[PDB]
């Protein structure tokens, strides 16, 4: 139903941050919402029509732009480590009492990004594990059946994490443009496995 | 208290003429506008100052935005209606909502919309549905009725939302909504083709009153003209009764207002 | 000022029941709303309650009480894929959405009969439901938290724990 | 399309009295659609300081107005209201019943 841009974006401090709501449901009412822990949904702009904006309930630092109907675009002017939220839009038809339908959401994090390293560490019954340690930031997705992977993965400010599940381990990286004039190697978006 | 009133009323034209807007949205307690708002101006502002005086500047900032949404919803539904009844050129639609509060403390509520002046839909909290007075308004009932948490949404807002702004703005607007100004009465003599007896009240508020003439103190006469009630201008009414007379009665006239009974005797 | 007040994390186990509370103060009153939120995908709406009463929908149950400013959101016969956070969301009189904080709900997998051992990383599993993981105790070393693992076609259900580099309740058998 | 004549009523604010400053009201109510024209008029020339309220709704969805200036009334002097309306052929006059 209502669709958003890439579900996990690393982008630097001063950039300007295009983010994308899209319903094919034919719907006035447009929302931008940001999700922080221990805060509820929080709204940054809101839309009732084509060409209407109005502001929010934290509008500072943000701008929207409604052209078309089904596209609801949040801009992101001076990027800043405030900014790092889970962004939440959704769309709903005019009316107090309507619900909304929210779109898959993208978590956006604002230099020190490594890639994850896989491994697979073998065993009544069959039980593997496997484990990828060292990413950052903690933009990683990783046979449905008989899974658990760690909701939270795992002491210093910029520590990188380490998740455990019981191997595709799909990360999110820097894009190929606008990067690396700084060091050697380079963490981009990439699928990291370990086979057993 | 006596009993009170709040509703607001929308109003939309297709083709309005340059010196008229196309949307407009005006509240009132019970005779006094409180709120306004138009396509032109885009803004809720008061129309009275004990409106401006007690609510904060968020009150008119969220409810401009949601003028302009409904202004738009209205736009987008008076053309579908003109789309359903095959007419161009110029037609208006209208809403009214609100609420009573009376003396006895019970409470009444009422939403309806009209088009061209005509009743077109006419909502029952009670019953939770819609009247509709044609074919149009029939399939605009079922697209409403489809919405059943909107229903539910309009009950509580007509039963308890609304009460509760009537008493908030009638403690706002105590030295005006709640005041007593009684009338002045008199006695008028005038000649008709035979003569005639005027009974001419001015000057007080509120605008409901009772004036009655009586023939020998214990029967009320007929072929009795009654005057309007209409606003003086100062915030105060005025009204008049007058009957004819030939016969040698003892005529006396009886004028009621905010519980208080008058008499005027006539020789 | 106006706020929204539900518990910050609630646990149940499977199979039973639960009842995340939910009370406004706002002034005025035009709706609550009950939203389903799994972890990282998008919230789902759940129940619309504006007058008294209690509305049944599934294995869900919403209740409203404006004299209080109160309602909860009934979950019955708890499952594992309940396990998600709930949010509590109420309309003012000028129309304003706020938004609660969410409720995040935990199931306890009923295990009909463990065999709990501790199994490079060292692999905690098949324990009790009733047993908690304490966190990791020295900076070098690393612990994780409880994680339930279902194999569907086996109907199995069975809580596991990795530790990689202990100190906590593990039943003496 | 449903259409409404206006009901037009002149009168003094308070008791007229000459020499004696008051004001001249022209209440126009029960019409539609909504756009309407009304003047009063000084021994039947047109006033130009004339002030009016808001235009204003009844439970009918019809509409109404208040017309008025400040005026000192005279044993010579008549004023009336002029109004025109969708509804109406000709422009209405209708005097100020002095009585």
């Known amino acids: ?196 | 208290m006596r009993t009170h009133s709040l509703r607001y009323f929308r109003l939309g034209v297709s083709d309005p003429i340059h010196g008229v807007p196309e949307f407009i949205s005006v509240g009132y307690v019970d005779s006094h506008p409180i709120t306004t708002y138009d396509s032109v101006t885009r803004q809720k502002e008061p129309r009275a100052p004990w409106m401006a005086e007690n609510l904060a500047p968020d009150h008119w900032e969220r409810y401009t935005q949601l003028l302009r949404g409904w202004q738009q919803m209205f736009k987008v539904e008076l053309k579908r209606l003109q789309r359903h009844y095959n007419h161009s050129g110029s037609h208006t639609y209208q809403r009214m909502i609100g609420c009573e509060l009376l003396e006895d403390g019970s409470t009444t509520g009422f939403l309806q919309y009209a088009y061209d002046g005509q009743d077109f839909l006419i909502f029952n909290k009670d019953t939770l549905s819609w009247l509709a007075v044609d074919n149009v308004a029939h399939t605009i009932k079922q697209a409403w009725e489809a919405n059943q948490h909107e229903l539910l949404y309009q009950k509580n807002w007509l039963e308890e939302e609304c009460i509760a702004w009537l008493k908030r703005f009638l403690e706002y607007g105590k030295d005006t909504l709640q005041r007593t100004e009684p009338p002045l009465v008199r006695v008028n003599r005038k000649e008709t083709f035979v003569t005639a007896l005027f009974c001419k009240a001015h000057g007080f508020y509120p605008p409901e009153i009772y004036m009655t003439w009586m023939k020998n103190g214990e029967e009320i006469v007929q072929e009795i003209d009654y005057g309007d009630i209409l606003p003086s201008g100062d915030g105060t009414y005025q009204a008049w009764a007058s009957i004819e007379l030939q016969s040698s009665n003892l005529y006396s006239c009886h004028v009621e207002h905010s519980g208080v009974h008058m008499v005027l005797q006539v020789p | 000022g106006q706020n929204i007040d539900q518990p910050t994390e609630m646990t149940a186990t499977e199979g039973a029941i639960v009842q995340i509370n939910c009370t406004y103060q706002t002034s005025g009153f035009n709706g609550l709303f009950w939203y389903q939120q799994h972890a990282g995908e998008a919230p789902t709406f759940l129940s619309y309650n504006v007058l008294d009463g209690l509305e049944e929908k599934g294995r869900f149950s919403s209740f409203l009480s404006r004299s209080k400013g109160y309602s909860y959101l009934l979950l019955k016969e708890l499952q594992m894929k309940d396990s998600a956070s709930y949010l509590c969301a109420v309309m003012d009189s000028n129309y304003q959405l706020i938004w609660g904080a969410g409720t995040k709900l935990i199931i306890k997998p009923d295990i009909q009969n463990p065999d709990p051992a501790v199994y490079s990383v060292c692999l905690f599993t098949d324990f009790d439901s009733q047993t908690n993981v304490s966190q990791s105790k020295d900076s070098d070393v690393y612990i994780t938290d409880k994680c339930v693992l279902d194999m569907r076609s086996m109907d199995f259900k069975s809580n596991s724990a990795v530790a990689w580099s202990n100190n906590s309740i593990i039943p003496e058998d | ?99």
């Open chain 1, 1 to 196: 139903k209502v669709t958003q841009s890439s579900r996990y974006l690393v982008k630097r401090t001063g950039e300007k941050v295009f983010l994308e709501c899209v319903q094919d449901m034919d719907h006035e009412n447009m929302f931008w919402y940001r999700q922080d822990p221990g805060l509820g949904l929080r709204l940054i702009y809101f839309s009732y029509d084509v060409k209407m904006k109005e502001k929010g309930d934290i509008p500072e630092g943000y701008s929207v732009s409604r052209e078309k109907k089904e596209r609801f675009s949040l801009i992101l002017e001076s990027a800043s480590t405030n900014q790092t939220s889970m962004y939440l839009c959704a769309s709903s038809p005019p009316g107090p009492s309507n619900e909304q339908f929210f779109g898959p959401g993208t978590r956006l994090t604002v230099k020190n990004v490594f890639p994850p390293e896989v491994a697979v560490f073998e065993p009544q019954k069959a039980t593997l594990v496997c484990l990828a340690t060292g990413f950052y930031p903690d933009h990683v997705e990783l046979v449905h059946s008989g899974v658990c992977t760690d909701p939270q993965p795992l002491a210093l400010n910029d520590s990188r994490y380490a998740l455990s599940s019981r191997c595709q381990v799909q990360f999110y990286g820097l894009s190929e443009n606008d990067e690396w004039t700084q060091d050697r190697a380079k963490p981009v978006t990439q699928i990291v496995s370990a086979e057993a």
């Open chain 4, 1 to 99: 399309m449903i259409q409404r004549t206006p009901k037009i009523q002149v009168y003094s604010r308070h008791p007229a009295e000459n020499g004696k400053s008051n004001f001249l009201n022209c209440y126009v109510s029960g019409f539609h659609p909504s756009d309407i024209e009304v003047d009063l008029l000084k021994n039947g020339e047109r006033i130009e300081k004339v002030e009016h309220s808001d235009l204003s709704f009844s439970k009918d969805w019809s509409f109404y107005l208040l017309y008025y200036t400040e005026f000192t009334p005279t044993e010579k002097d008549e004023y009336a209201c002029r109004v025109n309306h969708v509804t109406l052929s000709q422009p209405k006059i209708v005097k100020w019943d002095r009585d």
